[PDB]
Design a protein around this ligand. Sequence first.
Ligand code: MG
Ligand code: ZN
Ligand code: ZN
Ligand code: ZN
Ligand code: ZN
Ligand code: ZN
Ligand code: ZN
Ligand code: ZN
Ligand code: ZN
Lengths: 358, 357, 358, 357
Amino acid sequence: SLSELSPCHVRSGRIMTVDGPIPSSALGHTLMHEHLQNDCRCWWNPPQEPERQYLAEAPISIEILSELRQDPFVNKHNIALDDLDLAIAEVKQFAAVGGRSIVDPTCRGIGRDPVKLRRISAETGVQVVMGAGYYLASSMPETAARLSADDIADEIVAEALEGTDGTDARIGLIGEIGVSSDFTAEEEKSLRGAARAQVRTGLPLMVHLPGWFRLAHRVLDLVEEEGADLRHTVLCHMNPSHMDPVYQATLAQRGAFLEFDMIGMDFFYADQGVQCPSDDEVARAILGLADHGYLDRILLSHDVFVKMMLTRYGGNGYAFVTKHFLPRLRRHGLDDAALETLMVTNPRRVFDASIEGH
Amino acid sequence: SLSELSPCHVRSGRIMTVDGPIPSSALGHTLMHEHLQNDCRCWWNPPQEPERQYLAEAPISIEILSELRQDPFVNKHNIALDDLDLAIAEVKQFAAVGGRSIVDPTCRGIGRDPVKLRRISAETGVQVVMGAGYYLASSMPETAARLSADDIADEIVAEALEGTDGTDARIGLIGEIGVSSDFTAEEEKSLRGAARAQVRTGLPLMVHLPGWFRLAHRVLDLVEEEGADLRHTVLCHMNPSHMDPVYQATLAQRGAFLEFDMIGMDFFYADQGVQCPSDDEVARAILGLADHGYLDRILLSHDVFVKMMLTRYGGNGYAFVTKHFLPRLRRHGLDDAALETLMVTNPRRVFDASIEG
Amino acid sequence: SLSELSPCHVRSGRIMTVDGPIPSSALGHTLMHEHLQNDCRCWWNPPQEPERQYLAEAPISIEILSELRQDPFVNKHNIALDDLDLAIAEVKQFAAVGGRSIVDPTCRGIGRDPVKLRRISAETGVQVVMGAGYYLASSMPETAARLSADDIADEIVAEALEGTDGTDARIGLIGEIGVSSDFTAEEEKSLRGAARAQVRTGLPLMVHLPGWFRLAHRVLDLVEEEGADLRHTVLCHMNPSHMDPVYQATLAQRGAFLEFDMIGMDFFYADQGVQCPSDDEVARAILGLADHGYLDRILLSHDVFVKMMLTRYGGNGYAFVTKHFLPRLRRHGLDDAALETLMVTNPRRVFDASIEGH
Amino acid sequence: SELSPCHVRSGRIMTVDGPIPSSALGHTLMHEHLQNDCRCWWNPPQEPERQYLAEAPISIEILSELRQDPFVNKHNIALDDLDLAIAEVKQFAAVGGRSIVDPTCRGIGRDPVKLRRISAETGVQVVMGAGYYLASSMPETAARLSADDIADEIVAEALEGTDGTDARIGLIGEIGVSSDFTAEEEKSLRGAARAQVRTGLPLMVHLPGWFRLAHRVLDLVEEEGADLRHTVLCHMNPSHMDPVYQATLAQRGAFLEFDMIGMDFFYADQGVQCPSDDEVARAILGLADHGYLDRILLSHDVFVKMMLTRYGGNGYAFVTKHFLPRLRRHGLDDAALETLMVTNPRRVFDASIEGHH
Ligand SMILES: [Mg+2]
Ligand SMILES: [Zn+2]
Ligand SMILES: [Zn+2]
Ligand SMILES: [Zn+2]
Ligand SMILES: [Zn+2]
Ligand SMILES: [Zn+2]
Ligand SMILES: [Zn+2]
Ligand SMILES: [Zn+2]
Ligand SMILES: [Zn+2]
């Protein structure tokens, strides 16, 4: 009969960062979905072609970038953000263009580390909000199998109230819960646990979608069924469904945030046989959603999750959305006020339910 | 006329390479539009902000590739393909995947050099066809002002029959004739001279178009009134108008080749404020044209023209179309017969009028 | 204090017809929006060109139908359904093809008459449901100016519980509430009173939209803030917005019924300068709405409201949707189950909240 | 030696009342039937509940049903009321109409005697067509006829007379091509095409509007050596949603005739629906936007009694009185309306008229 709400629940007016609560007004210019450190080794796509073996063991170098872009998971070096010093330098680029906060949804199974997040936040001066929960079935630890939906919910609640991974750092978002195109029983159990935790903690809920598929409405049905708040639920990886305006708009209508977290990402995922859309295509979709009154549901990010996405390795880094995509949205007809809404007001809205709509 | 026809005119069944004539059947798997060596200094886009000054004088390195992709012309090192050894290595990648010939439309003003082409063909074993004529106005030498359209046609005729740039290497195509969005009086004179040379030499004609505009029909009107053969006229840079199927299909109907020579190029040209389309968007356009029966008018290439487009500098190289785009077209529905038509039959059709449609 | 619910509220399982309550299961094959008798003289479009003067005064004859189709409101004889015997014969055609019920939304200002409706239901054997409330501004009674939103709600509640126009006939639907492209303060007051009546009586709410505009979301916003049930709110005249799938789908997602009540109407309204879409264009829009999972929100009717729409005058009559449009929907891809859903299940859903969705 | 005295390069047009300079054609309807017989398309109702729609004369109370199955009514499928035809045509002259091209040919009731009565009484100039229509309407005698025999007949009607009169044809046309494109219809079309070469008159071809046989039709016509720039493709209305199909046909040089303006019936016998005027207007705008305004023709194809104002139809003045205003609402200016109703019809019959909007 005790309340389990986070001291930084959506009706508190505060946000839980790895360094403690901050007023929602201090969030400022924000990147809603970025990985600062992680481990994607489980997604390694072994080259079966004899001609393509050199791509697996070699460290990222300028001469192999083209091939990596057509199959980023083929390279072992690429699939792990484990360079803290580089992470710090790359994040400083964001801070250099006004960046103030970063939401890191790296959860259980893919390298979440509060100790490392605090080091980055302290050295960069950029505020960091940490996520929680379980990812895709393949990344789930041996122990998850014995856990019930409520057991998973309990773990999340504890991280929002007590601490995480043996530290007193607490989460500020229940996030990047894995839902694959197969939407396995494990994943459903995981999502139900996250949704129940959303109700118990009052924290925003972020769900990883299989972007090239269309399970978003089924995802929201489940969240809604568990009693969670759709207006504080974020649907990740919307970029690939840019050509389905009805799909995207009806989702926004239900209240969920539509996160276009793949800005700048243009890879072809050989494994899945899917292509990331262009920024122009995404820009038009965003323009369409805004024209239909859903501007306050749109979120932008890069979803940096591999080394080749850092500028040091030829990538766009964490300052690309701010430096290059915003000007592109301008070219598509969006005004300054809209840009402020996208990078500042909407992120705040995800965490603060008292913020008026658009 | 007759005496001025190239030994390899479009009704000869032969093709003129920098190393001499070859039967059209020997052309094989081809890239219709690539620059092996060139000079694009005249297009350098000086960095306005003193904060981007480093992007101008610094050499290309993996750490600045993102910025360069948003403004390729800001970097001086990037705007000139001048390393022959690298050109040779990059071209071998194409040969390694079945590549047999490359058409280099580098013409006057942008660094055409028959000696270097011959070295590349010698060391790679890849057949090279050399272009000719004048490019965009800003690249034209001061001596071009004195030339009449006929004088320009005469120069082209001489390179088709006797030699080029002080060598005995003869051209096998007229082109990458520059037409800017402004279509200046000089560019018009240049194009008329090219069209007249097309009639006189009987060689294919290739025209550079400002891809983000829609001047193609005006271009064909002029080529046609000058008496040139539209069925052996190639319209370059069609990638940007992928969203205008009527425009593209009507051009194909008139008989011209639609060259999607920007496969793999995804830069944002800041100077002009235009964006290169994605390969998926281009693939859909190609499928559409084929659905309407215009498959025999489609050509593919990369238009490699700056350093960052080579694999050595993080780019796609000359083997990308073959290795990665053909599979993409396969994913879109084109069968193997169609891929053979695109990389072998069509290129042959450009140079040989006897190939059935 | 004390309940004001109609004996046939949406959770009653019954429906109020001019002849009393009937189980919702008895509604059957239904036309959700038809006028059996009405008066549209206040919408006459006088021909400025003296050459077209003859069309204004002349009676409807086969010789001038072409001209009338290009400007229906030019003819005085056309803008009033006043022949009860013809109405009865025309309605018998609907019954002749399986029709069981008709919903007549003719309200105050446009000729609502419970006496006539009863004679029609009596002689045709077709069940008739009567609407209520006020229509567009220009048709509103002088007295409506003094009425407050609550007074309007009170009038509607009285017709749902006691009787209407001096009779004991009670209403079964609240509506064909007028909302013009101008959405005047009076129309807003009218709609607010209607929505309050929806909450108090529990009866369905039907709203007239200026189809060629996009005010539907603003309409639902108002019905929503007044506490009314969007799930039993019908948005009329959706046909003209067939080319705006995002707009239509997002309205359906909010829960409102999308009424394509202009089936068969292909006139050009000279006055407004608007053109009625073709049945093929509408069929495609309907297919799309269904493809997106909104089939249970789709309603179909003719909105017969002028003499020229009756078969006697060369028009389609009341049996057109059933005899000709359903087959067209089949040619487009809909099966008999879907057709059954459109003409029976959905109409029942309008009046009965116990009907399962999907 | 077989050119009509009013061939397309003569500057003249052959009407049923003799030659007239092309400049005299004026405001014209390119495809209308003044008198005809469509009894062969009788679509009798096999259900008792629709038996009344068969032998009953058209009346106001059955119009809805007829619009859903035009051929179900006997009275409706024959324009045999000359007095009514005159009255209806006068409506067209009343709004500026000067000429009407009647493509009614062999098999569907062509009658020079009746056309002359109509022209004399209304003051409207009439151009008469020729050739054979759809397979199901060809006479038994056409079976033995070879393509050349068919062309011979057309030539005689162009130079000597028609059906025993001295009235001569001014257009070869409304040649029948069904969705099946039968052997007999192909022979008919080849004969028409050869006659186009011999007489130099324009060629008009009936197309199964809901299909896509136009390019195949133009292929045949072209190989028979006929003039594509004076070939008219009828019934383009139904392919309005295929801008590439329509634009490419226009690029080949043929006229695109939207002769079903105002026609909104559902042909139960074919299971096809006539498009709305708004949809057609959009298609016309698109073609003009891509520079094909000079290839666009408009008409009603009045061919059954219910299409006459007396029977609730639109009559022969609808295009002029109601569709032009619709085109204006869509964005076309007055000069474009002049181009559509006067200049283009003249272009059909006169090759000396230069192109453009
Ligand atoms: Mg002979
Ligand atoms: Zn993810
Ligand atoms: Zn992620
Ligand atoms: Zn170029
Ligand atoms: Zn080039
Ligand atoms: Zn209404
Ligand atoms: Zn109504
Ligand atoms: Zn016809
Ligand atoms: Zn006809």
